[PDB]
Amino acid sequence: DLSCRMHTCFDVYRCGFNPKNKIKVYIYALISREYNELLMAISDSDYYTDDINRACLFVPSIDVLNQNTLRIKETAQAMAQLSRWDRGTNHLLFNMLPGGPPDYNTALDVPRDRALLAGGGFSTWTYRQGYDVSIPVYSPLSAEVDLPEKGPGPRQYFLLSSQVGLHPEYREDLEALQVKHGESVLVLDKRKRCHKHQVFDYPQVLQEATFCVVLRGARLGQAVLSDVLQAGCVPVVIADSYILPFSEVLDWKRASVVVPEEKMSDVYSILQSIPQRQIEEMQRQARWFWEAYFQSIKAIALATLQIINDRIYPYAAISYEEWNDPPAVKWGSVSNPLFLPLIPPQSQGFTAIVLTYDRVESLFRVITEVSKVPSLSKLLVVWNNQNKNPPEDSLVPLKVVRTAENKLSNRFFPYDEIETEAVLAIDDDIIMLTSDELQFGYEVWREFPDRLVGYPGRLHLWDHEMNKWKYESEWTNEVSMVLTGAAFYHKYFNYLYTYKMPGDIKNWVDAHMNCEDIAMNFLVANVTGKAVIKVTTHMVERSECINKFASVFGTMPLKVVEHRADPV
Amino acid sequence: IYKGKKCRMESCFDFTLCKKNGFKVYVYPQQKGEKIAESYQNILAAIEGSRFYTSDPSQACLFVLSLDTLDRDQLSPQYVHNLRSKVQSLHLWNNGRNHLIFNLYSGTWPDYTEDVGFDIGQAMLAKASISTENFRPNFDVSIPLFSKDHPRTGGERGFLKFNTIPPLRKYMLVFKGKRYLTGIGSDTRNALYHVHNGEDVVLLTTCKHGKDWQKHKDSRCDRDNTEYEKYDYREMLHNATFCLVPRGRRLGSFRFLEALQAACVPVMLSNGWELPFSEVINWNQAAVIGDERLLLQIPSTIRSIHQDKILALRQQTQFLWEAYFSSVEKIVLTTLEIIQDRIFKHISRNSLIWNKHPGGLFVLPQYSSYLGDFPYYYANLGLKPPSKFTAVIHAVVAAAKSQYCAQIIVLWNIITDAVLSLDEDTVLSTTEVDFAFTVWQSFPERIVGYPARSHFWDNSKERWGYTSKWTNDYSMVLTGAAIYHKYYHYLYSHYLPASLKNMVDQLANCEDILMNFLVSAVTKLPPIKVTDHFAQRQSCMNTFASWFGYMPLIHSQMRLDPV
Ligand SMILES: CC(=O)N[C@@H]1[C@@H](O)[C@H](O[C@@H]2O[C@H](C(=O)O)[C@@H](O[C@H]3O[C@H](CO)[C@@H](O)[C@H](O)[C@H]3NC(C)=O)[C@H](O)[C@H]2O)[C@@H](CO)O[C@@H]1O
Ligand SMILES: *[C@@H]1O[C@H](CO)[C@@H](O[C@@H]2O[C@H](CO)[C@@H](O[C@@H]3O[C@H](CO)[C@@H](O)[C@H](O)[C@@H]3O)[C@H](O)[C@H]2NC(C)=O)[C@H](O)[C@H]1NC(C)=O
Ligand SMILES: O=c1ccn([C@@H]2O[C@H](COP(=O)(O)OP(=O)(O)O)[C@@H](O)[C@H]2O)c(=O)[nH]1
Ligand SMILES: O=c1ccn([C@@H]2O[C@H](COP(=O)(O)OP(=O)(O)O)[C@@H](O)[C@H]2O)c(=O)[nH]1
Ligand SMILES: *[C@@H]1O[C@H](CO)[C@@H](O)[C@H](O)[C@H]1NC(C)=O
């Protein structure tokens, strides 16, 4: 039934909400090594369970992928005899050759009144939009030969077409393009690719071209797609009405070029319009797609089950960036959680937090100086001494909080008493600040809600002699960090420091009693991916802290900027 | 065969008419004798004010009717009779081949189906409430259901002024809407008292539908009505985290757009509803989609959602509203751009442009399909801003600059992404230019320049102003000493309609003002300042604001300076 969707022909009572938002797949017990490997990959995943009454999906142990000897009536009989058919309400089916010798229906020919199909070649007419999933067609050449991981760059050829048994029209148009341009378009004829008076190896010839052509010879889905992705050349699918595999989640627009079948003589002109940078990007995306989804049957099975699980639990679906980022750009990505360009008004203010151990004579000065500024809402003071008590009745709203333990990281806890967004963390030692400076700092924070706005300026440099980072403060020519003393920042940064801090950085800063500002700067510069705004054995410890923070992150999130904000 | 209900672009569409790189839409003239609704007037004005509008029928490859098709219920007062004859009698109908039909309501009382009435044929319909089982995957466009008072231009700027953590409020799931005693589609609303709770899941219902509801009422309605009048609906949506948007008579409802304005994450209950612009917008980032069959355990599922997920959903809801749903002009332009992104499937927008700032309506893929050619997607990729800039000088003197300057272009009357626009009467040192470019590298989306001017709202004349001396703040930086992205040149030349630029040319100025308007509209962020002839500026600003519908300029009192 082509009209079936996930809201009508699917059953959601069977599997509902669970703490671990993963669907549970049950496999029936009964041939191709392909299907055997698919089932083994499913079994050794997080989705395999027993107690059929508890699982949601069902994957029959019947050979479906190859339609040449499918015995469609026998497959229908097996599906009926599955003893758990239930009109195929939740069953998942896998296929990669949806074609028949009389006619290519571009879909499985079994009845499958409501069964879910994960096919290789789907047309835009035989593909259920939110129900079915388009899976890649597997070529054994992907694992048979391990091509070198050649980097992106210039190549000898520009356009290539290595296919066998094409229709005469396509080949004639390709030969016309080759005689028209020459030395860039190479049409190969019949694991060996044979040109005129020259021989190439099929897996390795694709490495010499920056574009590889995939055409519709039969079934609308060709195994050459996986080889093209593996070799790194950008696939040019000229198979109109073809839905690219995993197009639901993957962005095929950044990895392949699709040209309609009518404009085949225009292929060269279309491909000349693409700049080289997008060529490199598409090559990297193709390599990543092969190594993550096309490489093995296990990747295909995992991606299919994960797409289905995202469909059944939309609130848990993984991110788009996780779907289509190579690990290089995934590590280089930012994904700022505070990305809305909204400017909060002056109605709210900042909940100032003052961290003190001793020096309760500058702290009174600090409170007096901070309280004079406008827009201040709450002056929280955190008391870390287990021994000394704060002066009671000797101290606009003010709250004094006592810490269970004396840890330096108690100035960054998310307190429910904070009803604003800006948080001004200020220490007692800083006294040369006026009200107008704090007010202008808050005004600057209004336009930059997702980054530090701190008055002190400290940077870092690279030392050639020791091959380690160093902490530099004596001279000011550029700024990479602003100390948490008198630093405006979002309360979400406090939440991140308290909970989402990788490694043992919180434990380390608690133990060493120092280097909280550097850790805060590191975390903020990593999460937001933006620099900081400055408003106009001590050193060894700071340098060791910087080196440790760089080691735990694997790189240096800090960025050098030479600009400061001052009143107009 | 494939020319019936199962129409797609490669079967029921004439690519040869669009094969010319000139995608234009043609509006039928009015018959001057048929009643027309205000919403359809807004749709037609949005199409006609767009750059896609052309008067010559031959050049256009997209057609939109002049007859009101938005209201297709015979019980409604905007229904147009004998529309089948009036659509078959058209000379350019051509079986509705390249015709785009807008629709908002359909169906009769006994069963609200997709009764558009007249034979659509091969035309594509931008219907509001589309069931997924009756939606063409790459042919139809699902549009939001907007009111007759929905703004034509501009917008309400959303509601979420503060991004608060934890991203929670006084209640969690809220719904104040009518429950229908008889009819179709009231099951989910009637079954809400099962999950109604205290001040965590407050679900209000009203049985006062029509005039004969008294006969069909039950014992439950008596208590509901008194408690219904306790909370205000607009207030309730603002004290709520998740806004329930169930199915009423039809799949779509006005409550979806109200959930997005209120910044509450909508929890749709309508089964099989093709969400507005689903084919280009990822709806798992701005909303929570939950089946109405598992209605009882919905609140537990909502509680299971992590706080970071809630923060991301709320912000994405805000962005999506302010990008693609704020005004009917935005909806029409979104539908037209979705249409345009299917003719040439190599010059179209990827899924990252639609679902990230600034949105697809300001990102034109005809400039380039490479995300690195735009100033918005450097952080998302692993790229850095370009290190070289092209200096463009418009001459109607010194020009001493070598560092960071790949080339100098002098215009008498571009390879790098960054563009330095300079006026020959302005003298700038090379160190200043280098500092400006270094500042721009941190903020590639904005405009970084030395001159700055601001605006004001004069209540006496109800008119926008322009000041240029000793301002305490600023919202515009002149292009005469500014650094920006060449895509802004492309956007100015190919996005704004010819009228604004024509007035700019005829007034001999006001191009920098319009440039600042455009950049502030696309970025929604103020520019950065680094360190008789006066009368027409106000008219320029008023005309530009009238075209936009609001004032995109945002004040700023910061000033980046070297250390
Ligand atoms: C006993 C019985 O079977 N009664 C029904 C009677 O309730 C129906 O009356 C209603 O017609 C309303 C109407 O105004 O025509 C109709 O409201 C709808 O139409 C208006 C425009 O006229 C739209 O603006 C509304 O959005 C739409 N209301 C919705 C979506 O509910 C209402 O739905 C009907 O209840 C009557 C048909 O008129 O049929 C029987 O007599
Ligand atoms: C923000 O912090 C995260 C981690 O908290 C950073 O991700 C880490 O990035 C580094 C490289 O920048 C990755 O190192 C790489 O590890 C692989 C093996 O995993 C190795 O083969 C490579 O040669 C390289 O050393 C590291 O794995 C990665 N960690 C995680 C958990 O993803 C991220 O880069 C930081 N962001 C910024 C902007 O600094
Ligand atoms: O056991 C301790 C010692 C110090 N501090 C905090 O350390 C800060 C003082 O740091 P320091 O005296 O090093 O500042 P500096 O002298 O470097 O300006 C104050 O906020 C104290 O609350 C703390 O929380 N616990
Ligand atoms: O107390 C209320 C109840 C409803 N509405 C409005 O009524 C519409 C949805 O209510 P209804 O039950 O009529 O939805 P329908 O099922 O009729 O679409 C929205 O525009 C709401 O803003 C409102 O403003 N206040
Ligand atoms: C909901 O928020 C508004 C803020 O605009 C507030 O005025 C109102 O009192 C809140 N609701 C309740 C029930 O307090």
Structural summary, described in words:
Chain B: It is an enzyme of class 2 (transferase). Chain B: A protein binds at residues 75, 112, 209. Chain B: InterPro entries: Exostosin, Exostosin_GT47, GT64_dom, Nucleotide-diphossugar_trans. Chain B: This is Exostosin-1. Chain B: Part of the heparan sulfate polymerase, a dimeric complex composed of EXT1 and EXT2. Could also form homooligomeric complexes. Interacts with NDST1. Chain A: It comes from Homo sapiens. The complex is a heterodimer of chains A (568) and B (563). In chain A, helix 6 (224-231) links the parallel strand 11 and strand 12. Chain A starts with 24 loop residues before the first strand and ends with a strand. Among the domains of chain A are: 141-294 and 323-332, Glycosyl transferase family 10, C-terminal domain (Rossmann fold, 3-Layer(aba) Sandwich); 350-565, Spore Coat Polysaccharide Biosynthesis Protein SpsA, Chain A. Helices cover 30% and strands 16% of the residues of chain A. Chain A has 17 helices and 24 strands. Chain A is elongated. Chain A has 568 residues and is an alpha/beta fold. Chain A has an 8-stranded mixed beta sheet with strand order 17-16-15-18-22-19-23-24. In chain A, helix 1 packs across helix 9 (297-312) and helix 6 crosses helix 8 (276-294). Chain B has 563 residues and is of the alpha/beta class. Chain B has 3 domains: 1-151 and 327-366, no CATH class; 173-321, Glycogen Phosphorylase B (Rossmann fold, 3-Layer(aba) Sandwich), CATH 3.40.50.2000; 389-548, Spore Coat Polysaccharide Biosynthesis Protein SpsA, Chain A (Alpha-Beta Complex), CATH 3.90.550. Helix content of chain B is 27%, strand content 15%. Chain B contains 17 helices and 23 strands. Chain B has helices at 15-19, 38-49, 83-88, 187-190, 213-216, 219-228, 233-238, 255-261, 298-304, 307-325, 328-340, 351-354, 430-442, 486-494, 498-506, 511-523, 536-548, and strands at 25-27, 53-54, 62-64, 71-72, 99-103, 105-106, 124-127, 173-178, 201-206, 242-245, 265-268, 288-289, 389-395, 405-412, 418-423, 448-449, 452-453, 457-458, 463-464, 476-477, 481-485, 528-529, 560-562. Chain B has a 6-stranded mixed beta sheet with strand order 14-13-15-21-16-22. In chain B, strands 2-1-3-5-7 form a 5-stranded parallel beta sheet. In chain B, strands 9-8-10-11-12 form a 5-stranded parallel beta sheet. In chain B, helix 2 packs across helix 11. The longest helix of chain B has 19 residues, at 307-325. Chain B is globular, with a radius of gyration of 26 Å. Chains A and B meet through strand 14, helix 8, helix 11, helix 13 and helix 14 of A and strand 12, helix 9, helix 10, helix 13 and strand 23 of B. Strand 24 (563-565) of chain A pairs antiparallel with strand 23 (560-562) of chain B. A molecule of 3 linked components (NAG-NAG-BMA) is lined by residues 331, 502, 526, 529, 553-555, 557 of chain A. The site of a molecule of 3 linked components (NDG-BDP-NDG) has 7 residues of chain B, from loops.
